[PDB]
Design a protein around this nucleic acid. Structure first.
Ligand SMILES: [Mg+2]
Ligand SMILES: [Mg+2]
Ligand SMILES: [Mg+2]
Ligand SMILES: [Mg+2]
Ligand SMILES: [Mg+2]
Ligand SMILES: [Mg+2]
Ligand SMILES: [Zn+2]
Lengths: 37, 217, 95, 69, 69, 115, 107, 129
RNA sequence: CUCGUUGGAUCAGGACAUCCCAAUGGUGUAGAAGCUAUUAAUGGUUCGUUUGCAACGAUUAAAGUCCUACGUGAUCUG
């Protein structure tokens, strides 16, 4: 959950979500790819 | 009639009912454990149970240097020197872990306090641990030992030469020059001994207490 | 007779106050005006204790080492001492 | 003599009136159940209480001297 | 030097007998402890030192072997 | 009340501290949340240009009732590992150290007397 | 460094320094002090040398000494002056010329 | 039950090299029994000490409070203090240096205490002529 | 071809860009030490030695970074 200006997918399995007013990419395979805006 | 000092109430605005309750509890304990008569300067042996140990008691022998407290809070301090090490323990009369109190030698000293023994030579406070009790005569006046101790170098824990202490059991002449003694008198405060409103008269109270104390028997 | 002195937890101590530290800055600032640098140290302690700051900080300018207080020191083998100083590179030394 | 023995120090000078009340701390929330619910009425004479009521840990006077066996 | 050489022999022998009568502490160690101490101390002594060292057995043996059980 | 700078008496038999010479050892640090150190409290002691941990076994300050008040501040030298430096302690040591939180059994074994 | 006086003697302490002089002088074998200070033929105990030299200088002081029965101020020989006075003589050359680093010449 | 006989028997099971058992007269306000044991290695002390404490917790002591393990900071002396019994465990080198057995066996004649003498009362050093 | 207010004592107010306490993500997170990140301003945030501030010694759960005209001289002081 690194907070970055730009959210970019790091893998094919990565998907995008809009939770609690911010954009999140969560990857089932790798928790490392989890991010927040 | 020797009335234990704690029984006499101190003056104030406290109601007598507080003292009456405390006396009743105190008298009950005296039945279980007898508190022998003793005065400051008498050598005492006290047996007390040690909470740290398991079913084991301990004894300490020393000369009673101070009596303080009122009611169930009454305490006494007895002092002795062991292996060249001076030790003082403050003992509570009615503590439930005291098994016995023994008056090895019943005697009175010239002073009401023996705190100055800290500045006296070691011999004047050393007492044999296993010293056997001496015979005592009830139908007599308590012996008054008039020994005047010898002090160690001048720097003392307190200024015993000063008039406020009113010590009458120290050999000042050997330790202090006459000029010093005159200097101490600058703090004499002679007026105090002659103000009639500083006197606490317990004649009626002592008579009243004795009847009730004897009544419980 | 006797035995080697044991440390037994002894600690090295120093006072090194501000003026000692502040003085060092002036040495750096005033280095330009100095044509050459003379190192003065006690003869009785030729090299056991020395301040390395001088050589590194003042190494730019030429440095010559002089051991003063020679009278209060024993110099039975002074020649050997010079060799050790020469070994370090400080060949030019006057007592 | 209607005397209650309360641990530690109580505010006020000696002979000062106080307001004793059941404790409000969370641990003491339901300690009133065992005690008389409205109050105790001696006139009722349901039971004759002893003069002095003690707690189990308290060492009553006239008991044998405490031994730490 | 000692109170009597007969007592020394008797005393030292007495300690060995006492060791044979023991319950908890190691039999072998007690024998070694007495032997080593007796071999060293009693070899060289003076009138005062020997009397004191001989006092060990009298007090030690007569005090449950120093409390050994 | 043993604090910083207090001159203390090393009631022990250690050659380093028990020998009667040099100024009385002075307390440098008290291992308590408060500065004041009482019986059973460790303290750091400076002896002969060395820093040695010690243990308080008695002090001159009045204590709770039924407790021994000594006429001098007594302390015992303890190694870093906890083993006491001295092999014997002949002066009486208070027995309260047994139930105080900490490791004191080693000192009690060394101390023959008990008050 | 303390022996030659480069660092203030306060923080190090003359007493501790005084011992180092005895060890070094004894190890070197330059027993100049015995002649200057008439104490004995030779000694290697710091306590012993300090005791006698104070008598030679007639230096004494009153020092508090902790004892079991209290704190008593009892007069004592002035050890501190012996350390200070002894130290001064060494740097004034009375004891004799020394080489503190004599061990390092072999290297 | 946890007692001296069981404790020493357990010690023999773990095979402590040296075992000493000392009964303490009631006069001293201390433990009823004093025990000393030796150990081959530092690990041996840790193993045996832990084993004895584990047995104590299992073997009753439900009402009795638990016992701390002391000396783990050091590598050569571990002492455990039960309410009525105290066991001090040390390596052979530590045992001989301290000489615990002589202290408790000889209460006031032990050589180490004999060597120490009561310090003379400080007397002022007076310079004369 | 030289240079232009401020320590300390007393009492502290607030900011969070968190030093410690607390709640969590990720980890090149086995357990144990950590490292990286987010949320949170709740209370706390040491004693000395050298002494002109810079070092140092012992500790602590931590010995935070800053603003309040050196925060504060009609409260005191270098
Ligand atoms: Mg009063
Ligand atoms: Mg005083
Ligand atoms: Mg504030
Ligand atoms: Mg934040
Ligand atoms: Mg200061
Ligand atoms: Mg103003
Ligand atoms: Zn992914």
């Amino acid at each position: 959950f690194k907070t970055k200006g730009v959210i970019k997918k790091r893998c094919k399995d990565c998907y995008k979500v809009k939770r609690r007013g911010r954009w999140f990419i969560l990857c089932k395979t790798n928790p490392k790819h989890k991010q927040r805006q | 009639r020797f009335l234990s000092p704690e029984f006499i109430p101190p003056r104030g605005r406290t109601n007598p009912l507080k003292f009456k309750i405390e006396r009743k509890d105190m008298l009950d304990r005296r039945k279980v454990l007898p508190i022998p008569e003793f005065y400051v300067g008498s050598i005492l042996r006290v047996t007390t149970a040690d909470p740290y140990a398991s079913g084991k008691t301990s004894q300490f022998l020393g000369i009673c240097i101070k009596r303080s407290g009122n009611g169930l809070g009454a305490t006494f301090t007895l002092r002795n020197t062991i292996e060249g090490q001076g030790v003082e323990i403050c003992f509570e009369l009615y503590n439930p872990r005291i098994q016995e109190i023994q008056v090895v030698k019943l005697e009175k000293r010239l002073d009401d306090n023996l705190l100055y023994l800290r500045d006296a030579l070691p011999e004047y406070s050393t007492f044999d641990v296993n010293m056997k009790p001496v015979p005592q005569e009830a139908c007599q006046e308590v012996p008054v030992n008039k020994l005047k101790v010898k002090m160690k170098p001048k720097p003392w824990s307190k200024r015993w030469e000063r008039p406020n202490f009113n010590i009458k059991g120290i050999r000042f002449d050997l330790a202090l020059t006459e000029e010093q003694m005159k200097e101490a008198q600058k703090w004499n405060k002679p007026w105090i001994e002659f103000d009639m409103m500083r006197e606490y008269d317990t004649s009626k109270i002592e008579a009243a207490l004795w009847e009730e104390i004897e009544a419980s028997k | 007779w006797r035995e080697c002195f044991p440390l037994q937890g002894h600690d090295v101590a120093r006072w090194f106050p501000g003026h000692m530290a502040k003085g060092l800055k002036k040495m750096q600032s005033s280095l330009k005006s100095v044509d050459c640098v003379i190192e003065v140290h006690d003869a009785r302690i030729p090299f056991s204790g020395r301040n390395p700051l001088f050589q590194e900080l003042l190494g730019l300018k030429p440095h010559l080492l002089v051991l003063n207080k020679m009278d209060l020191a024993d110099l039975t083998e002074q020649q050997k001492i010079v060799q050790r100083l020469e070994e370090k590179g400080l060949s030019n030394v006057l007592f | 003599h209607n005397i209650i023995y309360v641990n530690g120090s109580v505010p006020g000078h000696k002979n000062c009136l106080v307001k004793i009340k059941d404790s409000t701390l969370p641990a003491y929330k339901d300690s009133c159940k065992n005690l008389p619910f409205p109050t105790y009425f001696p006139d009722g004479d349901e039971e004759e209480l002893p003069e002095d009521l003690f707690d189990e840990s308290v060492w009553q006077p006239s008991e044998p001297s405490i031994t730490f066996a | 030097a000692p109170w009597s050489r007969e007592a020394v022999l008797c005393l030292y022998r007495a300690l060995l007998r006492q060791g044979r009568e023991l319950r908890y502490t190691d039999r072998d160690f007690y024998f070694a402890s007495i032997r080593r101490e007796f071999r060293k101390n009693q070899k060289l002594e003076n009138l005062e030192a020997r009397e004191k060292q001989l006092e060990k057995g009298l007090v030690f043996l007569h005090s449950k072997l120093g409390g050994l059980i | 009340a043993v604090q910083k700078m207090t001159r203390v008496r090393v009631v022990d038999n250690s050659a380093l501290g028990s020998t009667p010479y040099h100024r009385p050892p002075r307390c440098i640090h008290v291992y308590n949340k408060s500065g004041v150190g009482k019986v059973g409290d460790q303290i750091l002691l400076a002896i002969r240009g060395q820093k040695k941990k010690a243990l308080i076994v008695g002090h001159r300050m009045p204590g709770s009732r039924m407790t021994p008040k000594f006429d001098s501040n007594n302390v015992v030298l303890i190694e870093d590992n906890g083993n006491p430096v001295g092999t014997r302690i002949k002066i009486p040591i208070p027995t309260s150290l047994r139930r105080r939180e900490g490791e004191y059994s080693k000192v009690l074994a060394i101390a023959q007397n008990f008050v | 460094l303390a022996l030659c006086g480069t660092v203030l003697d306060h923080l190090v302490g003359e007493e501790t320094m005084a011992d180092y002089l005895l060890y070094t002088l004894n190890r070197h074998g330059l027993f100049g002090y015995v002649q200057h200070y008439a104490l004995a033929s030779a000694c290697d105990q710091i306590e012993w040398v300090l005791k006698n030299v104070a008598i030679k200088l007639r230096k004494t002081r009153k020092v508090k000494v902790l004892t079991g029965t209290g704190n008593v101020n009892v007069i004592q020989p002035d050890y501190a002056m012996a350390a200070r006075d002894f130290l001064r003589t060494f740097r004034s050359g009375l004891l004799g010329q020394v080489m503190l680093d004599r061990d390092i010449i072999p290297a | 039950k946890f007692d001296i006989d069981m404790l020493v028997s357990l010690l023999r099971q773990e095979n402590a090299r040296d075992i000493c058992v000392i009964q303490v007269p009631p006069e001293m306000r201390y433990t009823d029994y004093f025990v000393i044991g030796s150990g081959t290695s530092t690990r041996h002390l840790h193993a045996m000490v832990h084993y004895l404490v584990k047995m104590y917790k299992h073997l009753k002591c439900r009402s009795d409070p638990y016992v701390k393990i002391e000396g783990k900071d050091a590598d050569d002396w571990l002492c455990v203090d039960f309410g009525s019994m105290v066991i001090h465990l040390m390596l052979p080198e530590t045992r001989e240096t301290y000489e615990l057995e002589k202290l408790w066996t000889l209460r006031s004649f032990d050589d180490q205490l004999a060597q120490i003498a009561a310090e003379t009362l400080p007397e002022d050093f007076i310079l004369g002529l």
